[PDB]
Amino acid sequence: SRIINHLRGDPVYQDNTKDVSLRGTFLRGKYDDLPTMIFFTEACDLTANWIPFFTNPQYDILAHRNVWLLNPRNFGNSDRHPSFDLQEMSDDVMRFMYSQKISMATLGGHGIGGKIALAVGCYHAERVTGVFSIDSSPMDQRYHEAFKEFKGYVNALTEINFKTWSDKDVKVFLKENIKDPKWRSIFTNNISKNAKTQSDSFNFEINYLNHNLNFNKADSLGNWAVKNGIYTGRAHFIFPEYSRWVHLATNTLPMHKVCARVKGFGHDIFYVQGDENPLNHWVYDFENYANVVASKLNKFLHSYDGVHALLKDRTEIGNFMIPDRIKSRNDSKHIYGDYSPAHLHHNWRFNHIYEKHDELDKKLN
Amino acid sequence: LQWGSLAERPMVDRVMSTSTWPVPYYQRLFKAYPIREKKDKMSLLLSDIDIDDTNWYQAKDFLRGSFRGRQIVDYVENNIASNTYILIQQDVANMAKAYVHDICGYIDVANKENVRILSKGDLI
Amino acid sequence: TLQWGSLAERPMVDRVMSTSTWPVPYYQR
Amino acid sequence: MNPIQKAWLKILEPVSYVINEKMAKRTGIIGKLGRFFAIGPREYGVHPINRMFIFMNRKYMAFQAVALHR
Amino acid sequence: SLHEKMQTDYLWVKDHSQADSWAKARTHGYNYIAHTVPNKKERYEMIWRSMGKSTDWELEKFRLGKKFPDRGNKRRWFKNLFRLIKNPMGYIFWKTYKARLAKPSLIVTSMFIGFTLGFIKLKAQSIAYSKKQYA
Amino acid sequence: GYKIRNKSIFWTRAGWKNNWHPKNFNAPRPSYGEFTMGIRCRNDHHSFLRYVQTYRNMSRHCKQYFLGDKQLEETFILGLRSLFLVPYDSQCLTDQIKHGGERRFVDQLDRDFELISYNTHPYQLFTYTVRNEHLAWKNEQYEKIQKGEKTFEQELLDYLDEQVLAEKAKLRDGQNFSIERMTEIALHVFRKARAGKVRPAQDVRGPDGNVNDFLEQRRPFEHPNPTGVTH
Ligand SMILES: CCCCCCCCCCCCCCCCCC(=O)OC[C@H](COP(=O)([O-])OCC(O)COP(=O)([O-])OC[C@@H](COC(=O)CCCCCCCCCCCCCCCCC)OC(=O)CCCCCCCCCCCCCCCCC)OC(=O)CCCCCCCCCCCCCCCCC
Ligand SMILES: CCCCCCCCCCCCCCCCCC(=O)OC[C@H](COP(=O)([O-])OCC(O)COP(=O)([O-])OC[C@@H](COC(=O)CCCCCCCCCCCCCCCCC)OC(=O)CCCCCCCCCCCCCCCCC)OC(=O)CCCCCCCCCCCCCCCCC
Ligand SMILES: CCCCCCCCCCCCCCCCCC(=O)OC[C@H](COP(=O)([O-])OCC(O)COP(=O)([O-])OC[C@@H](COC(=O)CCCCCCCCCCCCCCCCC)OC(=O)CCCCCCCCCCCCCCCCC)OC(=O)CCCCCCCCCCCCCCCCC
Ligand SMILES: CCCCCCCCCCCCCCCCCC(=O)OC[C@H](COP(=O)([O-])OCC(O)COP(=O)([O-])OC[C@@H](COC(=O)CCCCCCCCCCCCCCCCC)OC(=O)CCCCCCCCCCCCCCCCC)OC(=O)CCCCCCCCCCCCCCCCC
């Protein structure tokens, strides 16, 4: 009703990668003015599944930020385009932020969603306050067993023909071809019947997706290319102890390799204590995994997200002075010294809060 | 005095910053603590301590700051047969007794009224 | 980061394994 | 800050006036010279030697209490 | 359309009022480069991307424009030298903190000290033997 | 995938994508008869006929080593034309080249014929090697057909014709057997067939991220000393 507001639209196939519009759910915050959070769900996975996590009073995440549960191109309700270039998919978000009048946002993702979130910070860092990645890493996952199954399932889904196949023929096809319970449930709920019951189809573009995965090259979603670059801002990574996607042994190095400000394990990288279970990827289902992610998430948003690099925490804003490089300012009669860096309002561009407060300041004097 | 908007949070939570390239390489090791002052903040040791004597002793201290609280303290420490001020309710025995002894006392009120109304005159 | 460790352990930070096997051979092909 | 620094300021009161009021705010090399030799409180004026004694004094004194308290 | 709409929008591309007074990095990162880090190639991409935004991805303007050094690194050797003189123990302590996190055994630490002090002891004897040769 | 982002990639001081008349200080200037005493120039109008005679020599001198292979003469002719049609179809404005593209290409082709006259041109040696590898495989088929045996190529054609009948015998709802379906049927047979062969590892990485080379033998150590020859 009010707290839950998801704009409604129809996917449009686009020949130009720039004329792509993103659609998703918006969760309003408790308080009037709060920075915004953009969260990307797992590929081919529903945004609704993350609603109970962000709308739980015990966690109380909305008390911190407004949440945009957004679908990438070719997923959910967003527009469709065969290219999956993270640079193109990142510009899509920047246009969404512009159309919605968002100056800068907090980015999050689950699995492959984490990659999409980090790409935006890599291509648009001046407008991203922080990144919170869940069970993902900026890494090539083409040869990870977890990815192969997803890559394998998507290929099996191309065999079904909704026109000829009956509803029962589908259910039998999924159970036999899809062994994973969660993936199976995700795909079933992704099936939708268009108006006038003309026929049933998947909400996500099965053709464009399979080509990206089946080709299994740099543009594949499992792959993380050197072209994506480096993320300059705040980044926190949280993944299960026993995770098929991110192995603690070596899959943590890409974080240091791709994120410049990542301090290391115990500060920006954590593992959730858990058992070996292929379903641990879906932390929102298990309370134990979710409770830790939420606490760590609330801590990142409250103290670490949107904080200058050389400052430890948000507590140091206004009391820690950063050294200045000589000959860095245009003014020639400037005595170089330490300064506290400027932290701006989350939507200072599309509002006039600075113009308003300037007037109030004059009234004092 | 000024309180602002209840809905709005402190400007610190709203004010944000973003990164860019180039980036400083230095990774902060510790938080700066040039001046040793941590006033007005309570100790974090008071985290998971179970109920003890400090709870009823501090309760009286705060209750004695009010007029109604002073009556509770004086009555509890004088007119309650308990071997400890750490009151723990695990049964509603003492609560039901006080209710049946009160709600029952107000019985016969209607029958009493009937006596007056009916003793007024004889129908016949 | 630019502070990866000592020179002797530099060839350690290169390997990225696709499986959960321990210990992991360090050499990156 | 310490008493010895305060004594310098009283002695350098007229010098502080010339460099800060007149020179420091002038343009050109005269300004660069005044802003460079500006007089005031010391940037990075701490004395590590004095701080070193304080540390070693406190560390060695705690050792005295253990060795002497037998 | 939405792409060009936001590019032209002044609000979307507008420096904050205090932006002029802020310290500005006047280099793209091509003056001092990290050559042996595993993200070497990723660093170059951010330099290439920064150079393109300055010229609207028309790098002919960069070829024609003036190239400048990193004037922020000026006099950096002198400055570190004065900090070492001001407080050598603090300069040495913090510059070696991350290295000292991995402490070797008592045996190794003793070998370092023993061989170092023994080398200094022989150096002193050779200085003394030179005074014997001068006499 | 990846596109060049620099918009000025094809810019030169002479214009966009100009590889015919690069800009240089000593530019061509006209000459006037009434004022010109003498001149030393090597340009002439003999390039057209040299272009013709050069084609006839390169063709006739390479056919000396084809041994009457008519199919090779015709294939070589198509390749020889592709080498002479470069200036006629190139983006480069070969008519606007600095000092005459006609003379330039002719002199360049003459250097090729010099090697052809000695039978040392890489295209010649490449042709002999490519042809011998082809005839050896065609003779292997001929020897198998004369013996009544079936070739590996016919076993697939026959195995594919039946697989199509099985697919169209069940495709009754629709009746458009596209070329796409016909294609993915053959590829499924080629991958299965190619995998059956004992071929050297071509892809760097197999199903796992590990490389498929003989050097990708890591711990644990479980191989003993190597054994000697058996008598
Ligand atoms: C008619 C008769 C005429 C008579 C007079 C004739 C005289 C002719 C004068 C004309 C010549 C000057 C021309 C003007 C130059 C203008 C150029 C310019 O714009 O500035 C560039 C230059 C650029 O510096 P920058 O951009 O600010 O930053 C530097 C970088 O960051 C780098 O800094 P960094 O932190 O990164 O560290 C690196 C640095 C420092 O690196 C080092 O480690 C070197 C340290 C050298 C000093 C220490 C030596 C060691 C021994 C002493 C130990 C001291 C430390 C001990 C510590 C305590 C120990 C317990 O490297 C340098 O060497 C920097 C030098 C500046 C660059 C110039 C090119 C140098 C290449 C050659 C190097 C070898 C020469 C070294 C000369 C010394 C330079 C300081 O600035 C200048 O230095 C200008 C100097 C001009 C001063 C002129 C003053 C007036 C001269 C006349 C006075 C009267 C003289 C009378 C003489 C009588 C006869 C003997
Ligand atoms: C490379 C390998 C081979 C190395 C060989 C050895 C190298 C030389 C060794 C020298 C060691 C002597 C130590 C002296 C006592 C230091 C005690 C102390 O607590 O330190 C803090 C102490 C500061 O404590 P403070 O007195 O309270 O001053 C703070 C005030 O706020 C200061 O107020 P401010 O902030 O306004 O001042 C600005 C500041 C920054 O400005 C500068 O310092 C830069 C320019 C300074 C001029 C260049 C210095 C040239 C040498 C000085 C003159 C010759 C020697 C004088 C005698 C020094 C020995 C006491 O000035 C200072 O930092 C302090 C003043 C510097 C001294 C200048 C006056 C020198 C004349 C002394 C007169 C009084 C003594 C009577 C005469 C004694 C002779 C009989 O530092 C010093 O005073 C100077 C230390 C110099 C050390 C340099 C080299 C250290 C690192 C060597 C590494 C060895 C390799 C092994 C490393 C292994 C790593 C893995
Ligand atoms: C003004 C005077 C000028 C002249 C004198 C100039 C003197 C300059 C010396 C300056 C310092 C040297 C550079 C040090 C860089 C900073 C420290 C460092 O290396 O970062 C830590 C880093 C690793 O240490 P870490 O991160 O703490 O990990 C260790 C674990 O935490 C825990 O340990 P772990 O379980 O992993 O392994 C056990 C332990 C193994 O136990 C050890 O640490 C072995 C050391 C035992 C004591 C050796 C005797 C002490 C040497 C100094 C006294 C010299 C005696 C007099 C010499 C007379 C002839 C000149 O490993 C270590 O802890 C570190 C060993 C790695 C080698 C350390 C660097 C070489 C030794 C120092 C060179 C000294 C040169 C002085 C003279 C040079 C003249 C040209 O070391 C490296 O940089 C890796 C480099 C690869 C080293 C292996 C291959 C080296 C092959 C060349 C050997 C050269 C021998 C030279 C002999 C000298 C003549 C006899
Ligand atoms: C009731 C039962 C007994 C209770 C006894 C009470 C014990 C109280 C403990 C009190 C602890 C004190 C804490 C404060 C000190 C901590 C700071 C420290 O330096 O500790 C090392 C500390 C820890 O090192 P670590 O890497 O963790 O290794 C720990 C252990 O070494 C372990 O390393 P590991 O795991 O690799 O084990 C291998 C081990 C393997 O060792 C073995 O397997 C057998 C050892 C056989 C030794 C044979 C000796 C043969 C002698 C032949 C010599 C003949 C010449 C005689 C000349 C006669 C002339 C006629 O080899 C070593 O570890 C060598 C360690 C050197 C030990 C030297 C002392 C040996 C005898 C001590 C006897 C004490 C009574 C114990 C009775 C127990 C009997 C069951 O090192 C540091 O990192 C701190 C900085 C050290 C900088 C170096 C300079 C330090 C020197 C100043 C220290 C302060 C003042 C002096 C203190 C005493 C130092 C010896």
Tab-separated table of C-alpha atoms in Angstrom, chain F:
chain	number	residue	atom	x	y	z
F	1	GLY	CA	31.509	-6.761	-26.015
F	2	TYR	CA	34.138	-4.019	-26.097
F	3	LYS	CA	34.169	-0.963	-28.358
F	4	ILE	CA	36.844	1.683	-28.799
F	5	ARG	CA	35.704	4.620	-26.684
F	6	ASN	CA	38.083	7.257	-28.084
F	7	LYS	CA	36.123	9.137	-30.745
F	8	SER	CA	39.338	10.543	-32.288
F	9	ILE	CA	40.896	7.128	-32.943
F	10	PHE	CA	40.808	7.533	-36.735
F	11	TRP	CA	41.857	11.198	-36.745
F	12	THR	CA	45.023	12.303	-38.522
F	13	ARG	CA	46.530	15.683	-39.305
F	14	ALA	CA	45.377	15.054	-42.889
F	15	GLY	CA	41.824	14.050	-41.968
F	16	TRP	CA	39.749	11.121	-40.780
F	17	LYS	CA	41.228	7.686	-41.485
F	18	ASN	CA	43.627	9.132	-44.071
F	19	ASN	CA	46.213	6.508	-45.026
F	20	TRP	CA	46.717	7.686	-48.630
F	21	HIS	CA	48.206	11.184	-48.182
F	22	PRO	CA	49.653	11.674	-44.698
F	23	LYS	CA	50.490	15.274	-43.857
F	24	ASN	CA	54.179	16.132	-44.213
F	25	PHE	CA	56.050	19.409	-44.539
F	26	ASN	CA	57.569	18.726	-47.975
F	27	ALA	CA	54.230	18.661	-49.745
F	28	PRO	CA	53.806	18.220	-53.501
F	29	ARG	CA	53.888	21.457	-55.468
F	30	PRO	CA	53.272	22.200	-59.152
F	31	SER	CA	55.867	22.778	-61.852
F	32	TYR	CA	55.770	25.397	-64.610
F	33	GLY	CA	57.382	24.743	-67.971
F	34	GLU	CA	58.353	28.313	-68.823
F	35	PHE	CA	60.411	28.503	-65.611
F	36	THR	CA	61.715	24.916	-65.321
F	37	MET	CA	65.153	24.228	-66.804
F	38	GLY	CA	65.612	20.549	-65.966
F	39	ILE	CA	64.011	17.904	-63.790
F	40	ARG	CA	64.793	14.451	-62.397
F	41	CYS	CA	61.697	12.290	-61.939
F	42	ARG	CA	61.045	8.553	-62.036
F	43	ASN	CA	57.280	8.662	-62.619
F	44	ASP	CA	55.974	7.356	-65.938
F	45	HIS	CA	52.848	5.956	-67.605
F	46	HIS	CA	53.998	2.323	-67.806
F	47	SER	CA	52.276	0.999	-64.676
F	48	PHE	CA	49.094	-0.128	-66.444
F	49	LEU	CA	50.860	-2.595	-68.740
F	50	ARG	CA	53.227	-3.676	-65.966
F	51	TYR	CA	50.149	-4.479	-63.883
F	52	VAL	CA	48.888	-6.657	-66.744
F	53	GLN	CA	52.144	-8.469	-67.508
F	54	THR	CA	52.768	-9.009	-63.797
F	55	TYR	CA	49.483	-10.898	-63.459
F	56	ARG	CA	50.283	-13.118	-66.445
F	57	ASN	CA	53.732	-14.002	-65.099
F	58	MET	CA	52.644	-14.730	-61.528
F	59	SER	CA	49.878	-16.968	-62.875
F	60	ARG	CA	51.932	-18.783	-65.509
F	61	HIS	CA	54.993	-19.242	-63.284
F	62	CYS	CA	53.002	-20.642	-60.355
F	63	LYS	CA	51.138	-23.109	-62.580
F	64	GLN	CA	54.479	-24.775	-63.347
F	65	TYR	CA	54.249	-26.565	-59.983
F	66	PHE	CA	50.537	-27.452	-59.942
F	67	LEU	CA	51.057	-30.627	-62.013
F	68	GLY	CA	47.946	-30.013	-64.097
F	69	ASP	CA	45.640	-29.920	-61.065
F	70	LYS	CA	42.738	-28.057	-62.646
F	71	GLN	CA	40.968	-27.512	-59.324
F	72	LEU	CA	44.162	-25.962	-57.950
F	73	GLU	CA	44.640	-23.653	-60.936
F	74	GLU	CA	41.106	-22.321	-60.488
F	75	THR	CA	41.463	-21.952	-56.717
F	76	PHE	CA	44.821	-20.222	-57.176
F	77	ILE	CA	43.286	-17.875	-59.753
F	78	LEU	CA	40.644	-16.754	-57.259
F	79	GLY	CA	43.405	-16.103	-54.740
F	80	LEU	CA	45.577	-14.256	-57.241
F	81	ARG	CA	42.723	-11.895	-58.124
F	82	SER	CA	42.136	-11.141	-54.442
F	83	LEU	CA	45.715	-9.847	-54.359
F	84	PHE	CA	45.276	-7.605	-57.413
F	85	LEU	CA	41.821	-6.277	-56.477
F	86	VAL	CA	43.106	-4.722	-53.241
F	87	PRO	CA	43.477	-1.200	-54.729
F	88	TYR	CA	40.103	-1.403	-56.486
F	89	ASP	CA	38.056	-2.208	-53.367
F	90	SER	CA	40.071	-0.776	-50.466
F	91	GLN	CA	38.860	2.020	-48.225
F	92	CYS	CA	42.169	3.733	-48.988
F	93	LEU	CA	41.728	6.184	-51.862
F	94	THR	CA	44.396	4.539	-53.987
F	95	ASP	CA	43.845	7.210	-56.646
F	96	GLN	CA	44.854	9.978	-54.203
F	97	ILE	CA	48.029	8.350	-52.865
F	98	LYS	CA	50.976	10.677	-52.295
F	99	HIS	CA	53.219	9.986	-55.293
F	100	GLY	CA	51.141	7.584	-57.370
F	101	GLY	CA	49.568	4.446	-55.973
F	102	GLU	CA	49.679	2.748	-59.363
F	103	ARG	CA	53.479	2.767	-59.466
F	104	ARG	CA	53.613	1.796	-55.785
F	105	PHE	CA	51.468	-1.338	-56.043
F	106	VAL	CA	53.104	-2.461	-59.293
F	107	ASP	CA	56.579	-2.260	-57.771
F	108	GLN	CA	55.273	-4.140	-54.736
F	109	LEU	CA	53.819	-6.930	-56.873
F	110	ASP	CA	57.078	-7.192	-58.824
F	111	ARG	CA	58.896	-8.083	-55.605
F	112	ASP	CA	56.391	-10.908	-55.157
F	113	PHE	CA	56.959	-12.272	-58.662
F	114	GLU	CA	60.716	-12.234	-58.083
F	115	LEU	CA	60.138	-14.758	-55.302
F	116	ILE	CA	57.656	-16.663	-57.465
F	117	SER	CA	60.229	-17.036	-60.238
F	118	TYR	CA	62.444	-18.864	-57.733
F	119	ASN	CA	59.527	-20.840	-56.236
F	120	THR	CA	60.226	-19.396	-52.784
F	121	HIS	CA	57.099	-17.345	-52.095
F	122	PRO	CA	55.359	-18.347	-48.837
F	123	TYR	CA	52.035	-18.600	-50.676
F	124	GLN	CA	53.588	-21.214	-52.966
F	125	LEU	CA	54.937	-23.364	-50.137
F	126	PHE	CA	51.669	-22.823	-48.274
F	127	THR	CA	49.810	-24.039	-51.365
F	128	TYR	CA	51.847	-27.230	-51.760
F	129	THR	CA	51.467	-28.127	-48.083
F	130	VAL	CA	47.735	-27.389	-48.029
F	131	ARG	CA	47.122	-29.411	-51.186
F	132	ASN	CA	49.140	-32.458	-50.118
F	133	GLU	CA	47.217	-32.543	-46.837
F	134	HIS	CA	43.994	-32.467	-48.861
F	135	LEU	CA	44.875	-35.169	-51.389
F	136	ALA	CA	46.065	-37.530	-48.654
F	137	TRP	CA	42.604	-37.314	-47.090
F	138	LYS	CA	40.823	-37.714	-50.431
F	139	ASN	CA	42.937	-40.766	-51.252
F	140	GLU	CA	42.106	-42.266	-47.859
F	141	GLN	CA	38.427	-41.933	-48.765
F	142	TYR	CA	38.961	-43.381	-52.240
F	143	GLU	CA	40.772	-46.428	-50.860
F	144	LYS	CA	37.941	-47.007	-48.377
F	145	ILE	CA	35.262	-46.714	-51.068
F	146	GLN	CA	37.019	-49.093	-53.461
F	147	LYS	CA	37.093	-51.601	-50.586
F	148	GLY	CA	33.332	-51.175	-50.160
F	149	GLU	CA	33.927	-49.724	-46.693
F	150	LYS	CA	31.965	-46.722	-45.448
F	151	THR	CA	33.697	-43.407	-44.814
F	152	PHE	CA	33.481	-41.555	-41.517
F	153	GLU	CA	31.793	-38.722	-43.423
F	154	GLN	CA	29.020	-40.958	-44.782
F	155	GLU	CA	28.304	-42.522	-41.387
F	156	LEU	CA	27.386	-39.055	-40.114
F	157	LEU	CA	25.325	-38.130	-43.174
F	158	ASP	CA	23.386	-41.372	-42.738
F	159	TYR	CA	23.213	-40.985	-38.958
F	160	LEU	CA	21.948	-37.416	-39.388
F	161	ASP	CA	19.301	-38.223	-42.007
F	162	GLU	CA	17.619	-40.651	-39.610
F	163	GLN	CA	17.815	-38.255	-36.658
F	164	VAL	CA	15.896	-35.725	-38.757
F	165	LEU	CA	13.137	-38.242	-39.485
F	166	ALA	CA	12.808	-38.967	-35.764
F	167	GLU	CA	12.448	-35.247	-35.026
F	168	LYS	CA	9.956	-34.445	-37.796
F	169	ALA	CA	8.006	-37.652	-37.124
F	170	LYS	CA	7.109	-36.169	-33.717
F	171	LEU	CA	6.875	-32.524	-34.870
F	172	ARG	CA	3.242	-32.686	-35.965
F	173	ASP	CA	1.834	-29.659	-34.133
F	174	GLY	CA	4.178	-27.542	-36.244
F	175	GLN	CA	5.659	-28.366	-39.629
F	176	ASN	CA	8.444	-25.762	-40.056
F	177	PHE	CA	11.704	-27.693	-39.635
F	178	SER	CA	13.947	-24.643	-39.581
F	179	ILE	CA	17.615	-24.596	-40.521
F	180	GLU	CA	18.378	-23.710	-36.895
F	181	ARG	CA	17.013	-27.033	-35.638
F	182	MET	CA	18.833	-28.910	-38.398
F	183	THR	CA	22.037	-27.151	-37.333
F	184	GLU	CA	21.985	-27.848	-33.593
F	185	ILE	CA	21.340	-31.516	-34.395
F	186	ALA	CA	24.600	-31.736	-36.335
F	187	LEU	CA	26.575	-29.828	-33.702
F	188	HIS	CA	25.336	-32.192	-30.993
F	189	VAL	CA	26.737	-34.992	-33.158
F	190	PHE	CA	30.016	-33.208	-33.884
F	191	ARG	CA	30.747	-32.384	-30.240
F	192	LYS	CA	29.978	-35.965	-29.230
F	193	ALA	CA	32.057	-37.274	-32.137
F	194	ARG	CA	34.959	-34.878	-31.596
F	195	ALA	CA	35.036	-35.655	-27.871
F	196	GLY	CA	35.236	-39.352	-28.711
F	197	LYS	CA	38.465	-38.756	-30.605
F	198	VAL	CA	41.748	-38.730	-28.677
F	199	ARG	CA	42.676	-35.165	-29.585
F	200	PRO	CA	45.269	-32.897	-27.946
F	201	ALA	CA	43.874	-30.401	-25.462
F	202	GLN	CA	42.969	-27.203	-27.333
F	203	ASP	CA	41.100	-25.159	-24.722
F	204	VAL	CA	43.165	-23.811	-21.839
F	205	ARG	CA	40.684	-24.902	-19.173
F	206	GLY	CA	38.629	-28.070	-18.983
F	207	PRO	CA	35.357	-28.444	-17.076
F	208	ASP	CA	37.204	-27.297	-13.953
F	209	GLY	CA	39.188	-24.072	-13.860
F	210	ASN	CA	42.395	-26.107	-13.905
F	211	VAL	CA	44.446	-26.173	-17.102
F	212	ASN	CA	44.395	-29.381	-19.154
F	213	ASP	CA	48.159	-29.517	-19.756
F	214	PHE	CA	50.699	-32.108	-18.651
F	215	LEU	CA	52.164	-29.451	-16.327
F	216	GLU	CA	48.973	-29.064	-14.258
F	217	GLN	CA	49.885	-31.906	-11.900
F	218	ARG	CA	49.861	-30.442	-8.394
F	219	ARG	CA	49.846	-31.959	-4.932
F	220	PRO	CA	49.079	-34.399	-3.461
F	221	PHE	CA	52.093	-36.446	-4.552
F	222	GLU	CA	51.066	-40.023	-5.330
F	223	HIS	CA	53.311	-41.057	-8.251
F	224	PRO	CA	56.367	-43.242	-7.527
F	225	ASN	CA	59.718	-43.287	-9.291
F	226	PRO	CA	59.518	-43.823	-13.068
F	227	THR	CA	59.978	-47.382	-14.276
F	228	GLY	CA	62.352	-48.569	-16.978
F	229	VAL	CA	61.793	-50.505	-20.170
F	230	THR	CA	60.523	-54.076	-19.930
F	231	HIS	CA	62.386	-57.021	-21.444
